[PDB]
Coordinates of C-alpha atoms in Angstrom, one line a residue:
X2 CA -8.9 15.1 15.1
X3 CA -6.7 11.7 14.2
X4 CA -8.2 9.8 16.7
X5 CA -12.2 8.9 15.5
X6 CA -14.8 6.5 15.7
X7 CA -17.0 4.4 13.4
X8 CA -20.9 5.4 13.5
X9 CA -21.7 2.5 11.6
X10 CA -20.4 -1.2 10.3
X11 CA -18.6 -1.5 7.2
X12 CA -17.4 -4.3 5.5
X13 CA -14.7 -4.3 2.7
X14 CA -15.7 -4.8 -0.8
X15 CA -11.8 -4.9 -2.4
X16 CA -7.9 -4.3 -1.9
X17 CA -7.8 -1.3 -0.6
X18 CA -10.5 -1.1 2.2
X19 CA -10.6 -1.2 5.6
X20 CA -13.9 -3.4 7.3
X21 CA -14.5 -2.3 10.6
X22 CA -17.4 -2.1 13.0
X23 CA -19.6 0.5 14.9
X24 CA -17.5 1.9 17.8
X25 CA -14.6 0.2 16.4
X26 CA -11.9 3.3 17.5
X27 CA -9.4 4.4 14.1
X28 CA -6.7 6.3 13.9
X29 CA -6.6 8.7 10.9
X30 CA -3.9 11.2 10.5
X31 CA -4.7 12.5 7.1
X32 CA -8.0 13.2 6.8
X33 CA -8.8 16.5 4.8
X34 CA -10.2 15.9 1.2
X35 CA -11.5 12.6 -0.5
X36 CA -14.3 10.4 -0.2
X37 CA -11.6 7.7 1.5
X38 CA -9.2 8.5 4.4
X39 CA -6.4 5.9 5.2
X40 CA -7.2 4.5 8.6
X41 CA -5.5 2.5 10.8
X42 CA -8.0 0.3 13.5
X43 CA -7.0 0.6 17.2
X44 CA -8.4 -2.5 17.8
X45 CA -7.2 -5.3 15.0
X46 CA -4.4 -3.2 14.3
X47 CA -5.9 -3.6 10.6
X48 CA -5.2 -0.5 8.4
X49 CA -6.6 0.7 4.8
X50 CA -9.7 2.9 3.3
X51 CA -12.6 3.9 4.9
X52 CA -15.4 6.3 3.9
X53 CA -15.0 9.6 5.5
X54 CA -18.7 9.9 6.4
X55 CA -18.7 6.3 8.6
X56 CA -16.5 8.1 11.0
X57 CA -17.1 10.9 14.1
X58 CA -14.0 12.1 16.3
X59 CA -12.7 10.6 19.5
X60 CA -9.7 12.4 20.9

């Protein structure tokens, strides 16, 4: 998938991360290894880190 969406809330702790809420839609085009994936919200047009186990796909 590069389309998913969030399972749960999450709110950023620093710099790099992305705070976004449950059904919140995020586009993620690389998403193979690492705890974060780069995500960009479909919403708030807001982009940065996420945790790869927050998300499920939708697309």
């Amino acid at each position: 998938s590069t389309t998913f969406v969030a399972l749960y809330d999450y709110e950023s702790r620093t710099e790099t991360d992305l705070s976004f809420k449950k059904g919140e839609r995020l586009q993620i085009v690389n998403n193979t290894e690492g705890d974060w994936w780069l995500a960009h919200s479909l919403s708030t047009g807001q982009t940065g880190y996420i945790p790869s186990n927050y998300v499920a796909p939708s697309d």
